[PDB]
């Protein structure tokens, strides 16, 4: 029945698989994965970003004790200081003769960089997660299907229902707690919400990028005004999204498990290249090519017509095909070690039809799964090589 693909997940490369179907004729795949997303039922705990000591304006009651009024930004460092004698033009702005108090207040406030090029924490749960694998079958058609956990939301994206395992993105490569810095996503703790203090990335907790309320301790320290005269000393130390960029965790857009990269995301895993994606689909007859084309492909033999030593597509091999009934026959190597560019290859009884492929060596004895019949296209060729070129079109690879 189902859409066989046992052939790995990559990205860049136009990599392929072959659907073993016996009720209908098999169908070729080009499994082009380059979009992968997670997206669970989640909750945004706080945007984070480094401080900006946008020195607030205190309600200085002046001398005889000063009381610090609660400003619309929760959590604030405020410290009375006496022994001042204010000046701001002329004289004191406090009501003692020179026994004046200056109540310095400084809270951490959202930076202008918080708005754009910032960090963003998440508690990442599961509720809506998706394993996304596009297959442009090529023999048939496109489908970019997803998986969904919540059942008031369709998982019938694509042609029908497509099941991945090892999943292509229904896991998170990052932890439950994740901090983010541009490209580099660090799967690293942060302190819950509404409690955060310095010594972590998430010490700043603004509920939005540019906010009105936040939780403001990033190791902001008021100290005694200089010269026994008014003003606000704000001593500010490093914080989340300043450090942890060289105190860094694992920078997932270059080190993600499941071969992915990550960025500022509502929780997604771009560009995955997981161990393998064994794709299995519950699809009608439309996703397959019909049995009338060939009930079973009866006889065939393959040999080169000059091949490649490379997983560039240029390898060719005639195949003296034969079939129970003549028609189309989608093809691809059933290991994907030869990645076949032919969506369909024609079969007539005792004819011969060349197909296109990419292999990886001078003697390409790769099976070709000619819609219910395998065949080795052996023969000596000339060796072209080029093996810096992107992720396998020979996938499942670990050979020459």
């Amino acid at each position: 029945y189902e859409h066989t693909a046992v052939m790995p997940n990559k990205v860049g490369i136009p990599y392929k698989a072959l659907v073993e179907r016996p009720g209908y004729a098999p169908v070729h795949l080009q499994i082009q994965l380059v979009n992968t997303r997670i997206i669970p039922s989640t909750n945004l705990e706080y945007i984070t970003c480094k401080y900006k000591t946008k020195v607030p304006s205190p309600v200085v009651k002046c001398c005889g004790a000063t009381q610090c009024t609660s400003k619309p930004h929760p959590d604030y460092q405020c410290q009375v200081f006496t022994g001042v004698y204010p000046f701001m033009w002329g004289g004191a702005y406090c009501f003692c003769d020179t026994e004046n108090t200056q109540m310095s207040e400084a809270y951490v406030e959202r930076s202008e960089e918080c708005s754009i090029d910032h960090a963003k924490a998440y508690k990442v749960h599961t509720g809506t997660v998706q394993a996304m694998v596009n297959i442009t079958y090529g023999s048939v058609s496109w489908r970019s299907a997803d998986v969904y956990v919540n059942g008031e939301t369709p998982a019938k994206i694509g042609d029908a229902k497509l099941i991945i395992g090892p999943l292509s993105s229904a896991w998170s490569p990052f932890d439950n707690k994740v901090v983010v810095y541009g490209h580099e996503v660090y799967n690293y703790d942060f302190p819950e919400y509404g409690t955060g203090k310095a010594g972590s990335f998430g010490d700043l907790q603004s509920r939005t990028s540019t906010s009105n309320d936040l939780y403001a301790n990033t190791n902001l320290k008021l100290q005694r005004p200089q010269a026994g005269i008014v003003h606000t000393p704000f001593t500010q130390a490093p914080s989340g999204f300043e450090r942890w960029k060289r105190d860094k965790g694992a920078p997932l857009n270059d080190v993600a498990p499941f071969g992915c990269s990550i960025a500022l995301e509502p929780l997604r895993a771009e560009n995955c290249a997981v161990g393998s994606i064994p794709i299995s689909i519950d699809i009608p007859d439309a996703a397959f090519t019909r049995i009338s084309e060939t009930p079973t492909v009866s006889d065939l033999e393959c040999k080169i017509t000059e091949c490649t030593y490379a997983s560039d597509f240029g390898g060719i091999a005639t195949v003296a095909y034969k079939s129970s009934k003549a028609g189309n026959c989608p093809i691809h190597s059933p290991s994907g070690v030869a990645v076949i560019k032919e969506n369909d290859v024609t079969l007539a009884e005792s004819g011969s039809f060349t197909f296109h492929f990419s292999t990886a060596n001078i003697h390409p004895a790769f099976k070709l799964q000619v819609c219910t019949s395998a065949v080795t296209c052996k023969g000596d060729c000339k060796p072209p090589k080029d093996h810096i070129v992107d992720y396998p079109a020979q996938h499942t690879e670990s050979f020459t």
Binding site: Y1, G23, Y24
Partner: peptide, 15 residues
């Protein structure tokens, strides 16, 4: 009917 219940496209009897 003899078969209803959303079909079984044959590659095997009742596949």
């Amino acid at each position: 009917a003899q078969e209803s219940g959303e079909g079984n496209p044959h590659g095997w009897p009742h596949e």
